[PDB]
Design a protein around this ligand. Structure first.
Ligand SMILES: Cc1[nH]c2ccccc2c1CCNC(=O)c1ccccc1F
Lengths: 401, 167, 282, 136, 349, 193, 173
């Protein structure tokens, strides 16, 4: 068709929208909607806002329709798509095939609910619901480290809420083996927020998070070794201790603080959760090992050779590097004890990093929905009317063969 | 509505008579248990289909059997907007049949919505509440279809004025 | 949001970002975006010949030649002037912004860039408004096929200017919800006596068109707007064009929001039935 | 693929198989003289229970229906109460027969008969409408 | 006097000789045996062996053996070895679910009605050390829902889904001897049809022989109760009810019947031998110093269909206490003398 | 008589005449327990459930044993699944997550009667059993037919015996009576178990 | 994992289940004399900033118990050091601290009584008591040439920040 398909990826925190073919979302807004809440008549249902415009509307309340990657309020979710389509994308829905996404383990019923809204409210001519993890893998094909397309791999998705280690085989997620890690972007901010409180004076209490989030996004990174790192910051503090300056909210004065240790301590809680979580202590490298060992023996190596990153919390400089080194130490040690208790073939561990990691899902969706094959695997409105909403329970995986 | 109360009375009494069910193993297939009014593989297990009509358009069809009862309803649809609202609302519920559990996924040809109450249902739930629910349902889908008609008209009037007032 | 916005947000947010970075003095990043707008409009924003210091914005309409036959080229030039360059292959109109030579008030060219589609339609309306204001009657009506199966007719009469929309409702039941809205438009004077007279004809075109190859069908609907001098004069003109060229998408937009609101009603009622049903359990 | 098409159960020698109307003129006679109760009891006589033609039965129903409509709302309770249990049960069967042919608001008064017929026969008579193998 | 054993249906029940223990099927594959202790009920046994839902239970009083039949087509005879019931398989030779089972009064045989449209009469053969069975087939055409033996342990009443109540001869000359004459007939060879009701509609949910066995009663889905008098050329008295169908019936005297069904409460019927007429005796479940002091939208003890009734003491000739179990998982014990005090207007016989 | 055995490994129709087995007249069917479990996994994926053929095999097998069955009249079974919810059943997985199984309960076992479903060549067990007995001792047929016994784990599916009998009759009626439904009631088929 | 010691030699002696590791010190105690350029007190001060964040620590050998003790003590030195205005006042308060009698294995108040063997008799009690005092002293004086930057009367905030953190969630206090 002359028109590109619409690609919409609704996440717990942010929703990425745009047109197929493009490399990046045309919009990236908070997954929130603001409404009046103080019976509905007239057009009260249309009186709302979404994204940034909704976060601080004086006389409107902010609601987050999605929790743990799953829609918890369909009324709100549906209104949210009204603006996603008519206000931002400005697409006449009847002329565009849409590609939506869903976290692994979304119930088949939820897909029927989605299809009911898209086909019966917006009358779309075609719909495809892809699982986020699988698009993330597709995205990794943009990397130089990969010369062969494949949808078999371990996806490490870390946003701001929780981190997921999702094993995937031939385009299908191995749900029975998924594991979750209680360490995400937010936790890295709180820890950094704690480190600052014990050292830097002058930070406006009401501006606590602000500064911490700023330090995390501007000066944080992952290091190879904590002592050799602390050692650096002490030997030549001049090169490693950076500075940050913010303005007092209620007095517009100017305050400055030294940004030191937290640069590498924040991201470190992935590999040493015990530093911040009293209830979780497994290093992210051990979770991945466990998940892969819990999977079919015959798919273990392919999984180790293709661990893919996805999400903002994986962007830290050297995240993959530290992960791959740690995973190769745990896996090689195991093979050591074995050989000794007696000679296994060395297992290749490879963490893949690419430029499109931040919004990997949307990018994978955008690239896949730009192909001719996307138009065959989609469920048309004609099949929705004849066979029913149950046809959206499954979406043929495509892109590799 | 001099004719509504009488109509709902006749319908209620018939349902009370029809919902006298019991568990029943299949005489046709070994180790199978099925609603007889659906498979109809044994004529002696099927009761006589009866209809209660209020007028030419509104009526209820009740088909009993030894272990199941099928109830079909022809809803009041005065005009086009009512026809499409009813058809949409009915489809809406049927799509959620698994949570409704006494709902048929499709209606009997000629009706808008059909229930399929089995002996398992009458074992677990007070059959008089199920009869109560079917009557309550018939009254409520008509009120909801009316509220829906009012809602659409009201919003259309505002939508037309907001556009027209801006010239 | 009741009324549809006229300006395209992707164009504005893309130009504003490139302009802000150009002024900060940052090295220009490459840009390549493809997107759409209502009714088959395709846009393209790119760097002509890879030169990242230039940002082009192009629009493609299948029916451009019809708008052109009614002064579209002249109107766009008056509006964009030097920004309007030769159209990029595949598109009908192209705007070129030099990141190395921007006006002092960039927030004014960005606004007009967001209205590219709107300006492409403007001429046909202004041309017939003008006729009306000059007593020139009997002039052949404009026929704009804004969609593969939808047409807009414009004609100027002695005291009134009429715009007729021939629209299709693919969904059989959308025709019925549409009638509800159209009936309210046809009685709009009961709320705004000075506003345009709206007429609605289901399945068949107004008699003046029963002789042309106009479309007839169960899913076709003809809506007529009667614009009066107070709407077509030089004072109201822009606002009036901003409303009338969005009407078709405004109507279909509201039918769809109507269905979404009915769904919340069904969710609440179905949810209530289930609570009553479950109270039948011990 | 051809052989699973025929329902062999249809010839199962272990299946189940089950084992001329009112006086048209007599009814008219009573109706013309305004003797409603008489017309009812006369129409509820010798029903086409064992007859095979779907026409004979529909003929009998028509007569019974014709009598029910001819009644005056306030004159229903009385007529019903002049029937023996077996009469009420047959009446009930006819009342359900009429429901299948709505018209001229006939169903409106039929709902009145159903109300009274039920008050006299109880839900039991409705039960006996459903259990019947040889019906009106 | 009501008690709830569970919330799901009690599929069926059976009391032991002393009425000191009751076996019930809690709507599943098992049979639970409850024993009273003080005024509480305690579960003493759990019989697991059936692969399907248990549809019938019967307890032979003198030999103290329990027999069960289920939708799995099997039947088991349970014997108490010390402190645990042991089952023994009985090939019923049916290919459809078993629906009901009853021990003959002489505890020499038991009958199983089933979906196979047949009745399986079972007896034990000591020479081969196992159970065998013969089939009474003709003219049964549908599922056999209910059974009840004549006191001579030869005549057998059966109610099936083909709308008939029948009396057969289950005479097995290999475990009993020539039966004395009966008003039902002289010739009683195995499988002989002695009697067949005339009704053309109404599944027969329950059947019962009177104490002396000269009268047989049954209830059908058509909301009617019937009584065939052998001492009157098998004439049949019928009584069409104004309420819902009854599913169970028993005699409490030679001319008194107690039935219960979908209305959820027990009702009394009386037979007028002279007029040959059945009459409604009234509902039996109506809403000292301790009594005066002490004294869902249902006004009945049971909150769902009563599916079984059985005499607890006083036999079918002069019953003083009977029991009811239902789809509401409850079991009620009714005292005939009390019901007589509370309702002076009550007859009986 | 004839022994129809089907386990987790494979299916065999072993005829036995007054004494021992006759390798000739003894055929195999390339469909059994393992295959049915595999098809159930495919059907559950087309339902929106993320099952892995190798990782959850044992879990789906247990679902098959507890919920699957053989439909008598397929055309009638599909109606129940399509128009009602009486076949829908919940099933808890080892982690506590609940899934809902319906039509797939009788759909998986159907492979035994329609091999092409799991894409295997041949005819269904029913049709295989028919052929076996037909091309055999014309003076032992009637004996064979009224003496068929099922054995093995993949033969305990509720309704299986009824389904076989229904097909053997359908095959007889035509492939040995040219559609003459007249002499049909004199055909004796009794399958043990 | 956390940082572990590597000074455990096959010839290394013991005091309870704590390794009696050689140190370079003038203070008195039963600590052997170290000839090499690094001793357990150095190793503990080096790894401190890291280890102090860990909640769990695998005891691979007796030297780790010695290392853990110094770590917990370095934390005790920071409480005091935190409140002083001179490298001089620090050294004088670091002396007093080292002399104060803290709890020892077997006594209530000493965290980890399940990991440290207590003195099997009065000789071990006094010897161990003295070895712990010697470690404290050397650690205390060696900690001031760190906590203070050439701008005397100033305890570096890059050492004062760990004062709120407790290694393994334990404290000698
Ligand atoms: C999620 C899960 N847990 C298991 C445990 C044992 C065997 C398989 C599984 C699976 C994968 C199949 N379940 C789902 O795909 C699923 C999806 C949404 C909601 C509930 C589910 F079970």
């Amino acid at each position: 068709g002359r028109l590109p398909a619409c690609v919409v990826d609704c996440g717990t925190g942010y929703t990425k929208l745009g047109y197929a073919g493009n490399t990046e979302p045309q919009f990236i807004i908070p997954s929130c909607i603001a409404i009046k809440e103080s019976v509905m008549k007239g057009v009260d249902d249309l009186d709302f806002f979404i994204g940034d415009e909704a976060i601080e509307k004086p006389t409107y309340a902010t609601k987050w329709p999605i929790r743990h990657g799953i829609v918890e309020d369909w009324d709100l979710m549906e209104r949210f798509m009204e603006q996603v389509i008519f206000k931002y994308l400005r697409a006449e829905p009847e002329d565009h095939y849409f590609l939506l996404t869903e976290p692994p383990l979304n119930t088949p019923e939820n897909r029927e609910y989605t299809a009911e809204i898209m086909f019966e409210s917006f009358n779309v001519p075609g719909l495809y619901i892809a699982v986020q993890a699988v698009l993330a893998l597709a995205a990794s094909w943009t990397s130089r480290q990969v010369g062969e397309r494949t949808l078999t791999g371990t996806v490490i998705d870390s946003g701001d809420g929780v981190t997921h280690v999702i094993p995937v085989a031939e385009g299908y997620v191995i749900g029975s083996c998924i594991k979750h890690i209680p360490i995400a972007g937010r936790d890295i901010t709180y820890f950094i927020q704690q480190l600052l409180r014990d050292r830097e004076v002058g930070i406006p209490p009401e501006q606590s998070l602000e500064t911490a989030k700023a330090v995390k996004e501007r000066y944080s990174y992952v290091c190879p070794d904590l002592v050799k790192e602390f050692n650096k910051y002490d030997t030549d503090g001049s090169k490693w201790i950076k500075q940050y300056t913010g303005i007092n909210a209620i007095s517009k004065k100017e305050f400055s603080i030294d940004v030191g240790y937290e640069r590498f301590l924040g991201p470190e809680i992935f590999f040493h959760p015990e530093f911040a979580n009293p209830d979780f202590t497994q290093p992210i490298s051990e979770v991945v090992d466990e998940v892969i060992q819990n999977c079919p023996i015959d798919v273990r190596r392919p999984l180790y050779k293709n661990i893919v990153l996805s999400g903002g919390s994986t962007m830290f400089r050297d995240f993959g590097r530290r992960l791959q080194r740690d995973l190769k130490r745990t896996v090689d040690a195991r093979l050591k004890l074995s050989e000794e208790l007696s000679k296994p073939k060395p297992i290749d561990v490879q963490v893949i990093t690419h430029h499109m990691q931040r919004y990997a899902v949307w990018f994978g969706g955008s690239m896949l929905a730009s192909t001719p094959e996307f138009y065959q695997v989609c469920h048309t409105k004609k099949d929705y009317e004849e066979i029913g909403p149950s046809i959206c329970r499954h979406n043929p995986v495509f892109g590799v063969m | 509505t001099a004719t509504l109360r009488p109509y709902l009375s006749a319908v209620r009494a018939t349902l009370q008579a029809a919902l006298c069910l019991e568990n029943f193993s299949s005489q046709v297939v070994e180790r199978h248990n099925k609603p007889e009014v659906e498979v109809r593989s044994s004529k002696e297990l099927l009761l006589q289909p009866v209809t209660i009509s209020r007028n030419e358009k509104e009526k209820v069809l009740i088909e009993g059997s030894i272990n199941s009862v099928r109830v079909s309803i022809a809803v009041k649809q005065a005009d086009e907007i009512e026809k499409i609202l009813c058809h949409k609302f009915m489809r809406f519920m049927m799509m959620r049949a698994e949570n409704f559990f006494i709902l048929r996924r499709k209606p009997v040809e000629g009706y808008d919505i059909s229930f399929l109450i089995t002996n398992f249902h009458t074992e677990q739930m007070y059959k008089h509440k199920l009869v109560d629910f079917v009557i309550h349902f018939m009254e409520e889908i008509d009120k909801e279809i009316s509220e829906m008609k009012l809602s659409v008209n009201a919003r259309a009037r505002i939508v037309a004025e907001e556009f027209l007032k801006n010239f | 949001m009741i009324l549809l916005e006229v300006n395209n947000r992707i164009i504005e947010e893309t130009l504003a970002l490139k302009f802000e970075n150009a002024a900060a003095g940052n090295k220009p990043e490459a840009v390549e975006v493809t997107f759409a707008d209502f009714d088959g409009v395709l846009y393209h924003i790119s760097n002509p010949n890879g030169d990242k210091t230039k940002v082009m914005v192009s629009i493609s309409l299948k029916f451009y030649k019809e708008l052109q036959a009614h002064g579209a080229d002249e109107l766009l030039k008056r509006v964009y002037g030097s920004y309007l360059v030769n159209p990029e292959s595949g598109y009908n109109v192209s705007l070129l912004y030099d990141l190395e030579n921007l006006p002092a008030s960039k927030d004014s060219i960005v606004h007009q860039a967001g209205m590219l589609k709107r300006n492409c339609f403007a001429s046909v309306f202004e041309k017939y408004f003008q006729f009306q204001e000059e007593g020139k009657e009997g002039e052949n009506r404009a026929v704009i096929h804004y969609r593969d199966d939808e047409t807009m007719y414009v004609e100027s009469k002695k005291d009134r200017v009429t715009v007729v929309f021939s629209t299709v409702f693919k969904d059989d039941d959308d025709v019925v919800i549409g009638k509800v809205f159209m009936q309210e438009f046809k009685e709009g004077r009961r709320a705004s006596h000075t506003a345009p007279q709206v007429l609605f004809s289901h399945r068949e075109p107004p008699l003046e068109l029963k002789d042309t190859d106009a479309a007839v069908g169960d899913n076709i609907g003809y809506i007529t707007f009667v614009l009066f001098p107070r709407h077509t004069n030089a004072s109201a003109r822009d606002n009036t064009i901003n409303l009338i060229h969005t009407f078709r998408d405004y109507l279909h937009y509201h039918i769809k929001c109507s269905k979404a609101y009915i769904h919340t009603r069904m969710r609440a009622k179905t949810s209530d039935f289930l609570k009553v049903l479950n109270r039948a359990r011990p | 693929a051809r052989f699973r098409k025929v329902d062999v159960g249809e010839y199962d020698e272990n299946k189940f198989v089950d084992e001329a109307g009112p006086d048209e003129g007599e009814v008219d006679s009573c109706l013309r003289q305004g003797n409603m109760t008489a017309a009812l009891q006369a129409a509820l006589k010798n029903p086409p229970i064992n007859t095979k033609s779907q026409a004979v039965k529909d003929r009998a129903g028509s007569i019974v229906l014709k009598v029910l409509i001819s009644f005056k709302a306030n004159d229903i309770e009385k007529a019903v109460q002049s029937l023996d249990k077996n009469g009420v049960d047959l009446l009930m069967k006819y009342i359900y027969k009429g429901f299948e042919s709505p018209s001229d608001n006939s169903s409106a008064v039929l709902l009145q008969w159903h109300e009274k017929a039920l008050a006299a026969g109880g839900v039991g008579s409705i039960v006996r409408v459903l259990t019947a193998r040889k019906t009106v | 006097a009501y008690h709830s054993f569970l919330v799901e249906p009690i599929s069926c029940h059976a009391w032991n000789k002393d009425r000191t223990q009751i076996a019930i099927c809690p709507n599943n594959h098992e049979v639970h045996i409850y024993e009273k202790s003080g005024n509480k009920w305690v579960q003493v046994h759990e019989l697991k062996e059936h692969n399907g839902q248990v549809t019938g239970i019967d307890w032979a009083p003198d030999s103290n053996r329990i027999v069960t039949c289920g939708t799995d087509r099997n039947a088991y005879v349970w014997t108490l070895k010390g402190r645990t019931w042991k089952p023994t398989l009985v090939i019923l030779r049916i290919n459809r679910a078993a629906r009901c089972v009853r021990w003959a009064p002489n505890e020499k045989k038991f009958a199983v009605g089933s979906g196979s449209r047949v009745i399986s009469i079972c007896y034990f053969e000591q020479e081969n050390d196992w159970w065998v069975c013969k089939h009474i087939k003709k003219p049964i055409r549908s599922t056999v829902l209910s059974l009840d033996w004549h006191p001579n342990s030869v005549l057998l009443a059966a109610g099936s889904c083909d709308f008939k109540c029948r009396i057969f001869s289950a005479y097995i000359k290999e475990v009993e001897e020539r039966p004395a004459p009966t008003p039902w007939g002289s010739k009683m060879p195995f499988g002989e049809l002695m009697f067949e009701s005339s009704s053309s509609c109404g599944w027969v949910h329950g059947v019962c022989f009177s104490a002396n066995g000269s009268r047989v009663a049954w209830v059908s889905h058509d909301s009617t109760v019937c009584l065939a008098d052998a001492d009157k050329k098998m004439a049949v008295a019928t009584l069409a009810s104004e309420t819902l169908p009854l599913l169970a019936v028993t005699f409490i005297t030679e001319s008194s019947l107690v039935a219960a069904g979908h209305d959820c409460f027990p009702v009394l019927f009386t037979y007028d031998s002279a007029a040959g007429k059945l009459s409604f005796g009234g509902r039996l479940d109506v809403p000292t110093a301790r009594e005066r002091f002490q004294n869902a939208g249902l006004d009945s003890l049971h909150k769902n269909s009563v599916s079984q009734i059985s005499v607890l003491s006083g036999g079918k000739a002069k019953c003083s206490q009977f029991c009811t179990t239902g789809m509401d998982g409850g079991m009620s014990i009714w005292d005939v003398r009390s019901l007589e005090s509370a309702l002076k207007d009550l007859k009986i016989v | 008589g004839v022994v129809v055995d089907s386990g987790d490994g494979v299916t065999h129709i072993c005829p036995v005449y007054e004494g021992f087995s006759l390798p000739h007249l003894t055929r195999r069917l390339d469909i059994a327990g393992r295959d049915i479990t595999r098809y159930l996994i495919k059907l559950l994926l087309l339902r929106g459930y993320a099952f892995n053929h190798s990782a959850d095999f044992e879990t789906v097998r247990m679902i098959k044993e507890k919920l699957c069955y053989v439909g008598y009249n397929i055309e009638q079974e599909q109606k129940l699944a399509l128009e009602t919810t009486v076949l829908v059943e919940s099933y808890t997985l080892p982690d506590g997550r609940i899934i809902k199984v319906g039509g797939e309960r009788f759909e998986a076992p159907e492979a035994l009667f329609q091999p092409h479903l799991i894409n295997v060549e041949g005819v269904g067990v029913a049709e295989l059993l028919f052929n076996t007995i037909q091309a055999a001792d014309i003076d032992t047929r009637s004996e064979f037919y009224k003496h068929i016994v099922l054995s093995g784990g993949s033969t305990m599916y509720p309704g299986l015996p009824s389904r076989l009998e229904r097909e053997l009759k359908q095959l007889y009626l035509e492939r040995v009576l040219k559609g003459d439904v007249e002499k049909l009631s004199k055909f004796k088929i009794r399958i043990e178990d | 994992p956390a940082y572990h010691s590597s000074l455990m030699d096959p010839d290394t002696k013991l005091i309870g289940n704590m390794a009696l590791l050689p140190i370079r010190s003038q203070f008195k105690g039963p600590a052997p004399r170290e000839t090499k350029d690094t001793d357990i007190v150095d190793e503990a001060i080096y790894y401190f900033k890291a280890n102090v964040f860990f909640k769990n620590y695998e005891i691979k050998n007796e030297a780790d118990r010695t290392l853990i003790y110094i770590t917990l003590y370095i934390s005790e030195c920071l409480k005091k050091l935190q409140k002083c205005n001179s490298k001089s006042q620090g050294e004088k308060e670091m002396y007093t601290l080292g002399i104060t009698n803290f709890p020892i294995p077997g006594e209530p108040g000493f965290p980890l009584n399940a990991i440290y063997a207590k003195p099997a008799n009065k000789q071990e009690d006094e010897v161990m008591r003295a070895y712990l005092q010697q470690l404290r002293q050397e650690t205390g004086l060696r900690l001031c040439e760190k906590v203070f930057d050439p701008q005397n009367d100033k305890p570096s905030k890059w050492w004062t920040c760990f004062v709120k953190r407790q290694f393994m969630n334990k404290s000698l206090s």
